[PDB]
């Protein structure tokens, strides 16, 4: 599949608090969380982002705390993927489990406002307004399957469903 | 935003039964419904469709019965939009209410398997593999707002949320 949208570029070490400040963690509504996505470093993000857009960052994106809210804040902004040079281990796992696609690439090649086209099958990112394409690395194995199902929950109910018609 | 994927082309008068045969209506799981999307005319659709793809049809798509399951079957296949020459009135309404985007265009310009790029802001559909772009008509007014919120439910809770912080 192909994910195409506007890129919102950030730097290195964008941690969970920058993604979704601790004080907002006192809410249930995921959309409530989404309304403050990236508010830690860019108070204008929630008002600029559009469904289908992509967050682009530097090294160690999602750094810090084991917050499922961080990935939920991103996912509920209508963002299907995050492109970064590297991802904090815990964030990566949480992203996979909620259906948020973590993509690895040299983000120095991407500028804020660029229109990017991520082709998950070819594992390339076309930066349409810059007439260039860069390679990327998408999730594989189990993580790819969980992502394909849209998250851990779906993956598990599809596993049960199969077992259902098994007898 | 931009929706880009592979087009699955169908003809005129594709009714709700073709979209989701009556016998399957005895289920709760939307994914269960999705597994038989378009099974009425193409038993291979469920196995060919990929998240991000687009259904393209002729006149009067969604014809017939007031089945919310038809739009749910499409939406749960990972299909965000349906491009047709015209839409049955009831289907159109149901689509809007679940966040499925009904787009009007001369689909004779689109062939099965074409890669299409729907730009909702420019109201154009780029048929990338055919080096051509055609105009389309996207939803406006209230319908556009409901769609933007992702469905009637979200639209309503966003209306309440606003009222909440009002006093
Ligand atoms: Zn850090
Ligand atoms: Zn009919």
From Swiss-Prot, chains A, B:
pH dependence: Optimum pH is 9. Active from pH 8 to 10.
GO molecular function annotation: aconitate hydratase activity; homoaconitate hydratase activity; maleate hydratase activity; protein homodimerization activity; zinc ion binding
Site (Critical for substrate specificity): 26
Sequence motif YLRT, residues: 24-27
Enzyme category, top tier: lyase
Pfam family, one: Aconitase_C
GO biological process, one term: coenzyme B biosynthetic process
Pathway: Organic acid metabolism; 2-oxosuberate biosynthesis
Function: Component of a hydro-lyase with broad substrate specificity for cis-unsaturated tricarboxylic acids. Catalyzes both the reversible dehydration of (R)-homocitrate ((R)-2-hydroxybutane-1,2,4-tricarboxylate) to produce cis-homoaconitate ((Z)-but-1-ene-1,2,4-tricarboxylate), and its hydration to homoisocitrate ((1R,2S)-1-hydroxybutane-1,2,4-tricarboxylate). Is also able to hydrate the analogous longer chain substrates cis-homo(2)-aconitate, cis-homo(3)-aconitate, and even the non-physiological cis-homo(4)-aconitate with similar efficiency.
Subunit and interaction comment: Heterotetramer of 2 HacA and 2 HacB proteins. Cannot form a complex with LeuC.
Name used for this protein in its record: Methanogen homoaconitase small subunit
Organism of this sequence: Methanocaldococcus jannaschii (strain ATCC 43067 / DSM 2661 / JAL-1 / JCM 10045 / NBRC 100440) (Methanococcus jannaschii)
Name of encoding gene: hacB
